[PDB]
Amino acid sequence: NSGEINVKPTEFITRFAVNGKFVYVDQRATAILGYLPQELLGTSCYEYFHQDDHNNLTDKHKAVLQSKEKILTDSYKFRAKDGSFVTLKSQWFSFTNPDTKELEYIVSVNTLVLGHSE
């Protein structure tokens, strides 16, 4: 059956330029919590995130961008297209060109839980 497909789990993968949007998003984003590669892609990370921890998210991703070749992991909080206010648990690596050794993107992965274990 050519119509067979599967896009699960409760995780996704992404790229964000030092720009405030995920300049690339993967379709497991369409599965994890449910927003496209167009409802999350070229869509403002900071404004489309929770009312609080968007600072922490921004403080963390500058802690990724702080260097050009390293990886950080923290808990975050996110809300998909429909109504799924949810956690995110994510890891972001600064990505260098290096044609020039400039910082050129932040490549990354994302995971969630329904809430913290506390």
3-state secondary structure of 65: helix
Characterise 45 by phi-psi region: left (phi > 0), alpha (psi -120 to 50), beta (else).
alpha
Spatial CB neighbours of 92, under 8 Å, sequence gap ≥ 6:
16, 60, 61, 64, 71, 72, 106, 107, 108, 109
CA distance 72 to 27: 23
Spatial CB neighbours of 46, under 8 Å, sequence gap ≥ 6:
20, 54, 57, 58
CA distance 87 to 67: 26
Q: Domains plus CATH for the chain?
A: 10-118 (3.30.450.20)
3-state secondary structure of 88: strand
102 is written with which tokens?
């400039």
Give yes or no for a contact between 87 and 113, defined as CB atoms under 8 angstroms apart. Answer: yes
Give yes or no for a contact between 30 and 36, defined as CB atoms under 8 angstroms apart. Answer: yes
Q: How many CB atoms are closer than 10 A to CB 12?
A: 26
Method: NMR
* Residue 97 phi, psi dihedral angles, 5° rounding: -60, -30
CA distance 63 to 109: 16
Nearest Cα to Cα of residue 72 among 86, 56, 87: 56
Give yes or no for a contact between 41 and 23, defined as CB atoms under 8 angstroms apart. Answer: yes
